[PDB]
Amino acid sequence: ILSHQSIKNLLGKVILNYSEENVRENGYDLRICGDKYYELVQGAELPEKKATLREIEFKERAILSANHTYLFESCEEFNMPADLAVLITLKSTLARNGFLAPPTVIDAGYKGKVNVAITAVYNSSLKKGMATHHLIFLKLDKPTERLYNGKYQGGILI
Amino acid sequence: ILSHQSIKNLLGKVILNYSEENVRENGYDLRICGDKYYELVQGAELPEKKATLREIEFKERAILSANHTYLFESCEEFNMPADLAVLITLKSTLARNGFLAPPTVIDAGYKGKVNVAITAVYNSSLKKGMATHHLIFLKLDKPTERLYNGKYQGGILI
Amino acid sequence: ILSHQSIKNLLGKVILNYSEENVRENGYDLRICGDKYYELVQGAELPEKKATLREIEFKERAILSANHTYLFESCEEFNMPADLAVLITLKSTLARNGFLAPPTVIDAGYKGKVNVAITAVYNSSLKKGMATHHLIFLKLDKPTERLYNGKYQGGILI
């Protein structure tokens, strides 16, 4: 895992549209932004049918309904090198305040902002621009021979 | 963390019943399979009373109801060495499509397929054999003096 | 990540109010304890308004209602060094029995017990003193120049 100082050196290179204060003890606090956020309104039938989304204008705050999953675009944009990966964890502030998120990863070679899924256990809200996730940077044992080039490259929503 | 090439070398040794294409940038995509899958129908009273399960024939697709947790057996079988551990994360495809899963770990010394719990936020479905989780391989600072030999050894469901 | 033997050495130094038996293959099993546990009863409006909590006496067992998040104080107290961090994962026993928890982290420099959020998918219960989470210890590439000193220092609930 990369320390605070090691992450600080990633600013402006691996982590774009960053905030200096968001570099913590041993991770980076990802913020939610974007012109819109999405509410899943109908279940998915994977892999052929994706969940149905409701597009919502992201003004100042995102209003969430209990038992619904929401997709948010990160403020930060990534340009992952061939020797780094990131484990996306949830900030304990969101965890202890009734929000759920599964652990997911940003792969080496990935480029673009990320889209994170937050599920609300209660009717609640999150302020646009606030920090929601805690990124843990993992170093690969060797530069990967397979960089990311999947369907989400560039920050594709879903 | 192990890279793509390092994981590829684990095929047929640490990862059995594998798919070469499922070795990604810095992890392996676990698939759900098995003759049956399970729906938790009654809550648990831990540790004395486990949740009550409903056994379902796993034909072609698993039908999930909102607000229910389901147990799936992995296609892959594991034979973990004393110097490796695995962090089970959820594929972002499942995350952004309304599925929840908590982070869990496969310990050094563990042998057998794993049983993963996926919770559906919406009425939905998953296709038998599809990739649902992203495995991150962690190296222990030193070979562990305590290999796994717990109650789930061999791939015990619950 | 740290092996069983390496974790065992942290006992009485980094991990206080511990249990020898809880040092596993490659992690430590955190226990829930404390005089009280909390039920989130009203959603949060982050960051200005935290969720509303209901304080419950923690006698022998915590009774959980489906679709509710609960905050539990850990038995263990931490004194994190400048070169270590901890990934909090959920024990698979809780995962396969209908409990959800997001991945969260204990930062280098953090002092005190931790407060973990468990969400019940079903009406259920957890016994006081039982192991619920699996702690994975991560070593920082370098001693962090920024130790924890946030609002939760000392084990602040929320």
Ligand SMILES: O=c1ccn([C@H]2C[C@H](O)[C@@H](COP(=O)(O)OP(=O)(O)O)O2)c(=O)[nH]1
């Ligand atoms: O919560 C997340 C996690 C990761 N990603 C990005 C970065 C990662 O490199 C890419 C992975 O896309 P994929 O491998 O093609 O699909 P999956 O994550 O399901 O394996 O998606 C996100 O946008 N949000």
Ligand SMILES: O=c1ccn([C@H]2C[C@H](O)[C@@H](COP(=O)(O)OP(=O)(O)O)O2)c(=O)[nH]1
């Ligand atoms: O989602 C998971 C995670 C891990 N395991 C297996 C591998 C791991 O080594 C073992 C651990 O079982 P345990 O230590 O006996 O109980 P717990 O995971 O609750 O600590 O269970 C699973 O089958 N499913």
Ligand SMILES: O=c1ccn([C@H]2C[C@H](O)[C@@H](COP(=O)(O)OP(=O)(O)O)O2)c(=O)[nH]1
């Ligand atoms: O489930 C958790 C995770 C961590 N912590 C503690 C240890 C960690 O070092 C501190 C971090 O608090 P913060 O950085 O101030 O807020 P956040 O976790 O939301 O970024 O909280 C807990 O009590 N419970």
Ligand SMILES: [Mg+2]
């Ligand atoms: Mg994980």
Ligand SMILES: [Mg+2]
């Ligand atoms: Mg996790």
Ligand SMILES: [Mg+2]
């Ligand atoms: Mg986790």
